[PDB]
Amino acid sequence: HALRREQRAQGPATIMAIGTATPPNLYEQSTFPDFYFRVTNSDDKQELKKKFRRMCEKTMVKKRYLHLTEEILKERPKLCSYKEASFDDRQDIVVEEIPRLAKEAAEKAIKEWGRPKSEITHLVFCSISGIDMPGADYRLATLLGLPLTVNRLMIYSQACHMGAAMLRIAKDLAENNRGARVLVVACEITVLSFRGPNEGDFEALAFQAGFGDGAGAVVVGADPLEGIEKPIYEIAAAMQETVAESQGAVGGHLRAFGWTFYFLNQLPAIIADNLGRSLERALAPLGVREWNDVFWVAHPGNWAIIDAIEAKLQLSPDKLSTARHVFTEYGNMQSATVYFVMDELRKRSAVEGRSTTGDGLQWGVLLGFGPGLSIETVVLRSMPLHH
Amino acid sequence: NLHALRREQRAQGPATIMAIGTATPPNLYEQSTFPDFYFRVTNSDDKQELKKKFRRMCEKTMVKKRYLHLTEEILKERPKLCSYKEASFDDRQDIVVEEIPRLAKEAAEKAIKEWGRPKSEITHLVFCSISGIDMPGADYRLATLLGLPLTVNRLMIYSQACHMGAAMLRIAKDLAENNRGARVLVVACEITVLSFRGPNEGDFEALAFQAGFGDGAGAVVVGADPLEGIEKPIYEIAAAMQETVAESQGAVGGHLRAFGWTFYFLNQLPAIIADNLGRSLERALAPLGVREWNDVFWVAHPGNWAIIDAIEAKLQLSPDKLSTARHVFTEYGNMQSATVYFVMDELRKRSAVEGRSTTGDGLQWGVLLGFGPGLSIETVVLRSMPLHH
């Protein structure tokens, strides 16, 4: 009780710095149909290819970054098989690369933060990929040269919503421990889900057109040091809820051939139509009355999803413009994406001369969604911009 | 403003463990006759000098009993499961995705029944397993089978090894402490379907995991600010921390491949664990000014007989201190992250039956210990609670 009051922080969790990274291989969406069909030896599937081209154009993605190259596909051709065993080839890659790519985003965040690594007390790290013991948390802590006493937590194989969920965890770690400085990191590399095309599974090609790679990192803490730590946002509330009877709406299976993902065509409608209950619970206490009263850091998912959310909530096009930019310029980087959107929102706020880091509004929602259906709402307070 | 609201949101006291339930699969595997069954069913009867090496292993493990989801009939339906290093992942995944959540349901139901409050009052779920990876997760499946509210904040932690049972306490501590009214369902479930396989002579390590490892689940409910007269704390979480021993990633670990999980270890793993406890125990027990290691009680993840022996021998603990770890490891084997919950359950049960003054065998402070790959040391400090008889 007396111990309890002393060992705990006083104020809200704060996002103090944001870093992002991608692999160095640019893949342009306009020539991706050509690369994909040539290197998976599928040039005799011209009708499927032409269909692939149309799908690519409609994804509205311009570029993605992938760790995978033609070199890697020639050296381990089982990565190309659509349903033969290829798990070992995939594991060899992700167990190594998931921590390396994470490091890039972590370093950049830690640099903006401007404090000694020795002052990090916790690391919370998520990825779909790179399962091994010890795990990717261990490897990442080690690459960065974190102190050995750092509390590490790895969250494997949760999908797109995990980015937001990490904020939910970081909130409690930062707030309940005086002095805690949490390194939060999302990294995804599509090597476990990449595969050649199948003429009887045209829809599943949506994951070959839509997913890219990337890592996002932040430093979260309560009680910012005056004149040394400048908060970008305050986490005011963070929560999750599950949509009844929507397990079949989106998800996947980890099998001998790697990850396969599935979705229903109505997934945009399903997400859009079930957001209102969540956001109500999160924002009514603040007395906001219009969805356009708050700023939005949305995980895109895909263009249809952004669309259906924009239509259902009646959002002016500025609200999700940041989700759209990031998605068009990088694709869906699963759990990482929302950090890119975050980063893009606070930079634009500064460049466009806005009063806050949330585009001039006080309150925001950071939104993640994934298999469940799972909705992660994280309520942000913006911080003043002094131009 | 948000300093104001901050005060309204947060809890007041320490996180407390409020209930503990445990469960196993229905299938009894006696260790005296396990070599028989394990050679019969893996079609390895036409080998005989290995058969005697293994009976000798099973004898030295000190395990009497384990419970496995696996049966002979399942191995008949899915022969690849008995293969040494052939691809078997699909079969293994078919079972774990389905069964991990079902076994965790049982432990959780038990905890919730001891607790005796409605499921609607559960606000978080933290759930770990080596196994059962699907999207949505095992966490989603358990939530649904239990009928938890849709608004429950879930967290699944896959594929961390044995120390994860203790690490969850470290997380639930912060969830319970930072939220007024938070009630956190903490569950651990392990089923060795992914690791079970037949023998190879050029491999001793694998052989140990066919002998030492068992199935089971544990569940506790964690909350701060207990409702007076309704919630009865068994322990208070005072502190929880993690430490990694330098240059020891090779001491114990594992790999997830198309043949399932493979686990390695160095023979000196007992020495390694015991020689590196002092640092953790200092940062943990010095604030309380503890004189002798024998002054606190111990809820230690057993791991194996040698490990228990190394710890007792290094900290000069009297036999009573780890006798609960020994009992669980003897009657259940090593259930990875779940084991420590069976150990906690044992200590508090005996404490009651034997007439003790507290839930920690009569003592005030105690340490709960997890270890696994890293090397990772999980240290949770427990304050026991009075036993009114």
Coordinates of C-alpha atoms in Angstrom, one line a residue, chain A residues 1 3-4 8-12 87-88 91-92 128 131-134 137-138 148-159 162 168-169 171-173 175-177 234 236 239-242 244 247 251-256 259 261-262 281 371-372 374, chain B residues 2-3 6 9-14 89-90 93-94 130 133-136 139-140 150-161 164 170-171 173-175 177-179 238 241-244 246 249 252-258 261 263-264 373-374 376:
Chain A
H1 CA 0.0 0.0 0.0
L3 CA 5.0 0.5 -1.3
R4 CA 2.3 0.5 -3.9
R8 CA 3.8 3.5 -9.4
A9 CA 3.7 6.3 -12.0
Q10 CA 1.5 9.4 -11.5
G11 CA 0.2 10.5 -15.0
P12 CA -0.9 8.9 -18.2
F87 CA 7.6 -24.5 -43.6
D88 CA 11.4 -25.1 -42.9
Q91 CA 11.3 -20.6 -40.7
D92 CA 15.1 -20.3 -41.6
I128 CA 3.1 -13.0 -36.9
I131 CA 8.9 -18.6 -33.7
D132 CA 11.9 -20.2 -32.0
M133 CA 13.2 -20.6 -28.3
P134 CA 14.6 -18.3 -27.2
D137 CA 12.3 -10.7 -28.2
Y138 CA 15.5 -12.2 -27.0
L148 CA 19.8 -8.0 -19.3
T149 CA 17.3 -6.9 -16.6
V150 CA 14.8 -5.6 -19.2
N151 CA 11.3 -7.2 -19.0
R152 CA 10.7 -8.8 -22.3
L153 CA 7.4 -10.0 -23.7
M154 CA 6.9 -11.5 -27.2
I155 CA 3.5 -11.7 -28.8
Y156 CA 3.6 -14.2 -31.7
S157 CA 1.0 -14.9 -34.5
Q158 CA -1.7 -12.3 -33.7
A159 CA -2.6 -10.4 -36.8
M162 CA -1.8 -6.5 -32.5
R168 CA -3.0 -1.3 -24.7
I169 CA -0.4 -3.3 -22.8
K171 CA -0.3 1.7 -21.2
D172 CA -0.6 -0.5 -18.1
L173 CA 3.2 -1.2 -17.9
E175 CA 1.4 3.7 -15.8
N176 CA 1.8 1.2 -13.0
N177 CA 5.6 1.5 -12.6
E234 CA -1.2 10.6 -24.4
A236 CA -6.1 8.1 -22.6
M239 CA -9.6 -1.5 -25.1
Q240 CA -10.5 -4.5 -27.1
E241 CA -13.8 -6.0 -28.1
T242 CA -14.9 -9.0 -30.1
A244 CA -20.2 -11.9 -32.0
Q247 CA -14.8 -15.9 -36.6
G251 CA -8.4 -15.3 -40.3
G252 CA -5.7 -18.0 -41.2
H253 CA -4.1 -21.3 -40.5
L254 CA -0.4 -22.2 -39.9
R255 CA 0.3 -25.5 -41.7
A256 CA 3.1 -27.3 -43.4
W259 CA 0.3 -19.3 -43.4
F261 CA -5.3 -16.4 -45.0
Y262 CA -9.1 -16.2 -45.7
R281 CA -17.9 3.2 -25.3
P371 CA -9.3 -12.1 -36.7
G372 CA -12.1 -12.5 -34.1
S374 CA -11.1 -8.3 -33.1
Chain B
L2 CA -6.1 13.3 -17.3
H3 CA -4.3 13.4 -14.0
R6 CA -6.0 8.8 -14.0
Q9 CA -9.3 4.7 -13.3
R10 CA -6.5 3.1 -11.3
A11 CA -6.8 0.5 -8.5
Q12 CA -5.5 1.0 -4.9
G13 CA -3.9 -2.1 -3.6
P14 CA -1.6 -4.9 -4.7
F89 CA 3.0 -30.7 -38.7
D90 CA -0.6 -30.8 -40.1
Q93 CA -1.9 -28.8 -35.7
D94 CA -5.2 -30.5 -36.2
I130 CA 3.6 -23.4 -26.6
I133 CA -1.6 -21.5 -33.2
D134 CA -4.5 -20.4 -35.4
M135 CA -6.2 -17.1 -36.4
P136 CA -8.3 -16.3 -34.4
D139 CA -7.4 -17.0 -26.7
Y140 CA -10.5 -16.4 -28.8
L150 CA -17.4 -10.0 -25.8
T151 CA -15.7 -6.9 -24.2
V152 CA -13.1 -8.9 -22.3
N153 CA -9.6 -7.7 -23.2
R154 CA -7.7 -10.7 -24.5
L155 CA -4.0 -11.5 -24.8
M156 CA -2.7 -14.7 -26.2
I157 CA 1.0 -15.6 -25.6
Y158 CA 2.2 -18.4 -27.9
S159 CA 5.4 -20.4 -27.9
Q160 CA 7.4 -19.1 -24.9
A161 CA 8.6 -22.0 -22.9
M164 CA 5.8 -18.1 -19.1
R170 CA 4.1 -10.3 -14.0
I171 CA 1.7 -9.0 -16.7
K173 CA 0.1 -7.6 -11.9
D174 CA 0.1 -4.5 -14.0
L175 CA -3.3 -5.1 -15.5
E177 CA -3.1 -2.8 -10.4
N178 CA -3.7 -0.1 -13.1
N179 CA -7.4 -0.6 -13.5
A238 CA 4.4 -7.8 -4.2
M241 CA 10.7 -9.2 -12.6
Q242 CA 12.5 -10.8 -15.4
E243 CA 16.2 -11.5 -15.8
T244 CA 18.3 -12.9 -18.6
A246 CA 24.3 -13.3 -20.2
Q249 CA 21.0 -18.8 -25.1
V252 CA 18.0 -24.6 -23.2
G253 CA 15.7 -23.9 -26.2
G254 CA 13.8 -25.2 -29.2
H255 CA 12.9 -25.0 -32.8
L256 CA 9.5 -25.2 -34.6
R257 CA 10.0 -27.2 -37.8
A258 CA 7.8 -29.3 -40.2
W261 CA 8.9 -28.8 -31.9
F263 CA 13.9 -29.1 -27.7
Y264 CA 17.6 -29.0 -26.8
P373 CA 15.0 -20.3 -22.8
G374 CA 17.2 -17.2 -22.6
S376 CA 15.1 -16.4 -18.6

